[PDB]
Design a protein around this nucleic acid. Sequence first.
DNA 1: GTCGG
DNA 2: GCTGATGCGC
DNA 3: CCGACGCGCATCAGC
Length: 326
Amino acid sequence: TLNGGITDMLTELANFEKNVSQAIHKYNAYRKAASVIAKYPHKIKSGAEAKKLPGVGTKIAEKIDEFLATGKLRKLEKIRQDDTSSSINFLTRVSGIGPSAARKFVDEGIKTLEDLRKNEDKLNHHQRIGLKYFGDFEKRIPREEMLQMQDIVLNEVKKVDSEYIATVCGSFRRGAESSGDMDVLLTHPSFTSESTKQPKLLHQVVEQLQKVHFITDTLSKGETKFMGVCQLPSKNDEKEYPHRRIDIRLIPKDQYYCGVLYFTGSDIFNKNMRAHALEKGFTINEYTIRPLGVTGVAGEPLPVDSEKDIFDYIQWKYREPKDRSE
DNA sequence: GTCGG
DNA sequence: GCTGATGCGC
DNA sequence: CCGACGCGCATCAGC
Ligand SMILES: Nc1ncnc2c1ncn2[C@H]1C[C@H](O)[C@@H](COP(=O)(O)CP(=O)(O)OP(=O)(O)O)O1
Ligand SMILES: [Mn+2]
Ligand SMILES: [Mn+2]
Ligand SMILES: [Mn+2]
Ligand SMILES: [Mn+2]
Ligand SMILES: [Mn+2]
Ligand SMILES: [Mn+2]
Ligand SMILES: [Mn+2]
Ligand SMILES: [Mn+2]
Ligand code: NA
Ligand code: NA
Ligand code: NA
């Protein structure tokens, strides 16, 4: 965190462009600039120094100069003081409320946790669950707990069918000490790019996790994707564990590695690897790696039996999940 | 907001 | 009541 | 200096 002051500012700037401006690309630009600086091994002493890095342009170089000189950023003082921006920014902290709904609630004078309680009948099911766990969802999950959660999920899955294969990905797979949520990748032999589909592969597992009361609520659920809420077992009287966000994604077994690579991240890493693979005549998504034709049309899915295979296809030195946290 | 074209 | 349109979070 | 940088699910506006 040699440049924690700078990256903190680029992030808050990023989130403003995301929630308020609804400018997803400026959002990206800011996270990208904060991502390269976070990887910069020297304490930045001036914007010009920062400007040398790809992602850090003119406007940001200046903001850095100001931050380095003033200890703060006026543009951000204004943002935190502006009632509209601050309310919208706050509302998006509730799961289920994105930029659009937050901005609408605000146009109607709904801008605080209290107003949501008051105007609850206006919220959808997902948003209601979001408000109910507003405090719990913002809590980081200690790896120590991510481990207990892993065992419960892996165990319950094996209890359903011994051939299932759940793999906890995301920041956890990256070896992080604490995580935002818990992401689980699932596969079964009876489900591949063909198989004429298998009904309820994800259901059964989700249903079992509910049977042992690990999963407490559902935000959205489909045949391949599940977003919900869970909670470690509570002693028998003592303090209850915080409710946590869990995501389960069922992917075809013959696409497992491309899937673990994606759901493992990091998010900026994926954006980085994708762009690279595209400079190398390949196109990568969360399911397959395809070669790009002389024209630009993606050929068929190359074979993949390991994350490294994907690194090889794009002339990139394989990096362990611990070195992808960009 | 950035940078390759 | 249906569905194209859009929002949401990953 | 211009302009590229999406998916599986839920909901509801416009019929
Ligand atoms: N828009 C996007 N573009 C590219 N990749 C994206 C993505 N959204 C999610 N991903 C992928 C990579 C993340 O590691 C992975 C998990 O998505 P996630 O939102 O759970 C964040 P994670 O990286 O696990 O850290 P944490 O904050 O939860 O502790 O999903
Ligand atoms: Mn150096
Ligand atoms: Mn009020
Ligand atoms: Mn995660
Ligand atoms: Mn997730
Ligand atoms: Mn019960
Ligand atoms: Mn509870
Ligand atoms: Mn490259
Ligand atoms: Mn432009
Ligand atoms: Na630069
Ligand atoms: Na939100
Ligand atoms: Na539809």
